[PDB]
RNA sequence: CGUAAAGCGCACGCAGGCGGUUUGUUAAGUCAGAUGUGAAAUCCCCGGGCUCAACCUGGGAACUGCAUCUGAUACUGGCAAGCUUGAGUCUCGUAGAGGGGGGUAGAAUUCCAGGUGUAGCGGUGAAAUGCGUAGAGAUCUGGAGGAAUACCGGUGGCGAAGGCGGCCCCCUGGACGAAGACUGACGCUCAGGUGCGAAAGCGUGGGGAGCAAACAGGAUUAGAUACCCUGGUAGUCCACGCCGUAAACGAUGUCGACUUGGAGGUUGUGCCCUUGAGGCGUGGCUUCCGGAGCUAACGCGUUAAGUCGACCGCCUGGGGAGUACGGCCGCAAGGUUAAAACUCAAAUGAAUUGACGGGGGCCCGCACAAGCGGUGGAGCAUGUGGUUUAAUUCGAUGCAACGCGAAGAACCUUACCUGGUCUUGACAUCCACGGAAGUUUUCAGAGAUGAGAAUGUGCCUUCGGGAACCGUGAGACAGGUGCUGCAUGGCUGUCGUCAGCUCGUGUUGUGAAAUGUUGGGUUAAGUCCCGCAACGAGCGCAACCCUUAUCCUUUGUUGCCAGCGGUCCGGCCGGGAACUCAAAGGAGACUGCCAGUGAUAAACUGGAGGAAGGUGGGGAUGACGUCAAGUCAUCAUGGCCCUUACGACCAGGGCUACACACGUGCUACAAUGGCGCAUACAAAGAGAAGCGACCUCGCGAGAGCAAGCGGACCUCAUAAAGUGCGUCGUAGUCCGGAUUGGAGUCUGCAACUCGACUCCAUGAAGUCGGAAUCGCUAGUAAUCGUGGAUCAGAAUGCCACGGUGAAUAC
């Protein structure tokens, strides 16, 4: 796309393959350097994800979830009982969860 | 029966002919039964060759046929006794001075002529024919071949009904004209009867 | 044991089984030990003897038991005393279609009497039977009578279940709640037993409005002992007695305990600013959804089908059969209890995939509708069935066989029939001998077999032969359009150019399988967007291909002639390369632009430009599979079969037969036409053993001489409907041309069976086609000609080409 032959050829086949990237980097987006299947997970709503907690126990991953009163403790390893749709709530949270990721030994 | 041979429809497409002389009325039907011949009596004679194609051409007056084979050594064989051989009985026939040349087809397992005759070989050298097309369509498409498709058909492993169980692997585009799809057909006779073999082989889209 | 077989229809309750909690005593059950016995053999264990083994045998263990004595006292039981958490009593209220008896009220139906009034009413899909000018129906007034009780009315209430619905009174049962008091385990279940028990039915006596088995009539129908219509008796209603059953069903026995939740309904009640349509609790009954758990699954899910305990009932493959016999009950109908012989290898439950539905939703196609023209009626052409025959060769048979294989049967083709003939053969390969082959002759016969004359050496061989060809002999074989398409390949039809068919990985389910592929839009299209336990991929759709519609570039003959010059006025010539055109290469059309609607998405609707506008028109292209569809007779092919014959050669015949029936076409029935004369405008093709000008002859089919052309040059070859004149005049006619007689031409050895065409004569049937049926959506249908393949000659068929050119689609 931003290098090589993008204008060739056609402009309908063109716009259709840059929609091709917003559909594949919107639902492909940030797992896409990641390369392995990661070691941890963290979902930010353990009923509204139940998916990928389902799919993290299928494989032995960690669950991290902020489950809320709806939630279920599924297979959760480490449950935290806080609120999963208050936009505060969930900067705060992941503000600091992202706090403590980026210490690595550094 | 209902589908159309795949090398006709493309004919003028990416596909040539197999003879490529110009004739009036006066001898085409002469110079088409003397190619029946020579492709008769020269696909006879090199069985064991494993030939592919064989092209005729006349360029005023003489033949000049080109064995598309897989194995040039053995058509040609220590210094070329076979061929010159092969060029006075082709002479014998057509009633033309005959040439002859041998074009090298290497890759043999993608051109279909010859996995055809690799599969109805071993089928009347009594092996299991799930076997000889899985492996057909395996080291098939282990070198290129975008696609393969095989098909063998009738009375398999000596049933009393006949079946026709297919394979095919990667994309065989078999409605789209610019596809350089590779076809050919071989007959076995088993102790059984007939069992035929198709093979579709997909080597590009233009 | 909800649905597979299996929960009594529901209760009350005796005998039976089981029984909260504390203390004391007993010690019956229970436990421990001891003693007596539990015969021997046998089984088991450790040994011993037969050479081993079986066998025999020594000692033990065992004989799971019973009796007695000695103890233990936790549990169960007995006895005595208690205790309240089970059960029950009392006080006060609450809600209720709980029951039984009696009364009353209002709407409505029917009937009766009367007033008005007049031709229908009623009924049905349509009708008719029925009622009605003796006055119906409609309408108003008065009366009688019977049954049921609109609205409230609610997965609302009450009842053990059956069941109970206006309002009021009387007699009466239960439930629930609040606080307190009392009894003190009084409890739970229950075989036999007893009671209650819808509806229909039965008995006696009433009642009888509506409704309605039976019944009758009318229809419907092939029939209609039915459904529908019009009447209509028992019955339904009351009193008393019987019956004793139901899909008497939550297909779920009763009682008790425990085990996450949510939303309601209904009926109590306490507390707290009530300061709402308050808040917060605590009971009883009940509805829906769901968690764990259970379940074959479906589902159940604090009202369990979960986790337990007590007692009862019942089940043991389907049918026979809940039947027969017997018993008991019953007035009867029947109820209850309850087999067997024989017979089958299944019967069954739940769920999955599909198919189907006179199930539902959405959508398409000349599918219907809207139209135009046909077919079925007539004559002929051609195919088929049948019949005939010596043979009428074989194959194709709903759609998808029936001018199909066959793009062309006189002989040939030909496979069939009748005769005449041949046997290593007509067609092969390999031998051995002889001879070059070949070429013109004659006789016999239907051809090949026989009898002769020349020509024979086409090139090499210590010669014994080879190249080519022909006879002869043995073979191994050759040959088979013989059988099997239900043993096959290949090729084909069809559903259907319908939009579908799948797979990998993942997930869900025990599993068959599911998802993806469904859902909201959209599309011609699983097209495209959006969503989504799916993520992707393949075959298919679309595009790439051919053609057609516009423009540009190139080249310009044989093709073209705008501008030029003269012209025998014809592109005819010099010439011109503009134009038509030819053929090669490009441009072009993609929802590209605009407006509006739409999830700001897909897209749809409309507009501009453009030759063309939304897959522009047409074609090619036909997914996985279905029909054990077609072909063994194109070919190939497994097996079977004939191999002096089912193989081969020949002549004549047949495939063309004709009481009949069907399919597909052509020509007609006419005036929108027939005939005569003149005259205009095509496209696409074919052509050397061929197309065959000009000119002469023939009325014509054609014949003679014969140019030109292997071809944008010559020939086939004049397009015809059209138009302009004249005539015919509604007639079986100047329609129609079948049929038949005569005379011919051509092709071909040969037109008798059995060609095509011409000329003269003849001149049927037919006046628009019954039931029914078909094609077509625009250069289409309709109609008019032309060409080609097969082919010596033989098309009304097939495949192509152009001319004129519609109607209609709500």
């Given amino acids: ?106 | 029966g209902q589908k159309v041979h795949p090398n006709g429809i493309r004919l003028g497409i990416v596909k040539p002919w197999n003879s490529t002389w110009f004739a009036n009325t006066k001898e085409f039907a002469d110079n088409l039964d003397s190619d029946f011949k020579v492709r008769q009596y020269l696909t006879k004679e090199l069985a064991k060759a494993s030939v592919s194609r064989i092209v005729i051409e006349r360029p005023a007056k003489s033949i000049r046929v080109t064995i598309h084979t897989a194995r040039p050594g053995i058509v040609i064989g220590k210094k070329g006794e076979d061929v010159e051989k092969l060029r006075k009985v082709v002479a014998d026939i057509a009633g033309v001075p005959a040439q002859i040349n041998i074009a090298e087809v290497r890759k043999p397992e993608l051109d279909a002529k010859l996995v055809a005759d690799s599969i109805t070989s071993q089928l009347e050298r009594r092996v299991m024919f799930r076997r000889a097309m899985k492996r057909a369509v395996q080291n098939a498409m282990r070198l290129g071949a975008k696609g393969i498709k095989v098909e063998v058909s009738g009375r398999l492993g000596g049933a009393e009904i006949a079946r026709t169980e297919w394979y095919r692997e990667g994309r065989v585009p078999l409605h789209t004209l610019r596809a350089d799809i590779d076809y050919n057909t071989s007959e076995a006779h088993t102790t059984y009867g007939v069992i035929g073999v198709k093979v579709w082989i997909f080597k590009g889209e233009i």
């Fill in chain 1, 1 to 106: 796309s931003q290098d090589g032959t993008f204008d060739k050829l056609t402009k309908k086949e063109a716009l259709m393959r840059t929609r091709e990237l917003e559909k594949l980097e919107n639902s492909l987006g940030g797992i896409k350097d990641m390369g392995g299947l990661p070691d941890a997970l963290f979902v930010i709503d353990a009923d509204h994800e139940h998916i990928a907690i389902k799919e993290a126990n299928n494989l032995g991953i960690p669950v991290f979830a902020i489950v809320d009163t709806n939630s279920d403790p599924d297979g959760v390893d480490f449950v935290i009982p806080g609120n999963d749709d208050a936009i505060r709530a969930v900067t705060l949270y992941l503000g600091a969860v992202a706090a403590t990721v980026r210490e690595g030994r550094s």
